[PDB]
Amino acid sequence: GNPWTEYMAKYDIEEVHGSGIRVDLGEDAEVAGTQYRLPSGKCPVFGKGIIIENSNTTFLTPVATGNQYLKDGGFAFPPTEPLMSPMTLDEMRHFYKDNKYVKNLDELTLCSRHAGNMIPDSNYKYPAVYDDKDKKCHILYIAAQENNGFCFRPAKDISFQNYTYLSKNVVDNWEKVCPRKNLQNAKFGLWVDGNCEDIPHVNEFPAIDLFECNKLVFELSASDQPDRYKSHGKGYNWGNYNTETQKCEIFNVKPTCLINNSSYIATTALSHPIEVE
């Protein structure tokens, strides 16, 4: 019937990711009688970071400690001896040199596993952020992602393009089952009776380039921010960007095929905001 099933599996975000994208708080965890909500998305969120409003401290700054002021710290794990975070890729592969099930993981999966290896037994597996520029893994002591209404929000700012936000459940085979690259000269579509038809209803936002389109799709993607709030991956996670009309055509149903159109680039809320293939 549909030849695109295997190729398009990775874009069934509700199945392969299964949690919020903009705000990922898809699992519950009990710790000494206290209930917590933790990110649980199985895919990496490329280009996502956290903006702390009305401060000048990056969210990757370690959390405030000792006498430091609260607003001089960030979301990251605090210093330890030996230093557990931030830890480089090479430092990680060496630190786990004797673990055969970890030492050769993908850098992102390795960062995820490392962040969930701070308590030996303990159900609190931190999320993490991986920086491809410094090849650095930052364990996030703070799993919160939005507090608009000490105020912060998630975002795909241009300066975050090399950051990847990782939940504790990121899969080792993400490169095969999760979206990353954007699709040049291709347009998401729905397969029907042997033909790839256009998405029958989209929401058009203006966007000057692919990056702004992806950032829009991210802003509108599945979100778990306040089961009643668990999105489970449902949302406006897909976008077809027309480069000639500069239109980000956003939609919220899983695509099932591709249309060849030299004017379009296919993107998702999880995809990298710039890279294309």
Binding site: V63, A64, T65, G66, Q68, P78, P79, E81, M118, Y124
Partner: protein, 99 residues
């Protein structure tokens, strides 16, 4: 980091003896537990009627039960110890003793 006084409810009867443990989940090697009486004096393991008992990540208050013995606060603090809990809360717990 998370701090909880295991007998969250402080409800004692005169002449009784009470044990209030302060447990810390996610204890970091740079953190330290400290109990404080309602007056505000830092209790120490010197074994007066009311004292404490250490463990790597937990300190057990030991309150006896005078009608004037009553809110005790446990605090986790340290130079590299986080100033916030996992829930962006203050790293302290409180138990109100009612005789």
């Amino acid at each position: 980091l998370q701090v909880d006084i295991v007998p969250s409810q402080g409800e004692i009867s005169v002449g009784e003896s009470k044990f209030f443990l302060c447990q810390v989940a996610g204890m970091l090697p740079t953190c330290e537990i400290s109990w404080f009486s309602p007056n505000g004096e830092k209790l120490t393991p010197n074994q007066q009627r009311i004292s404490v008992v250490w463990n790597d990540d937990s300190s057990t208050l030991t309150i006896n039960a005078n009608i004037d013995d009553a809110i005790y606060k446990c605090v986790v603090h340290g130079p590299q110890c986080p100033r916030l809990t996992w829930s962006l809360g203050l790293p302290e717990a409180t138990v109100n003793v009612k005789i």
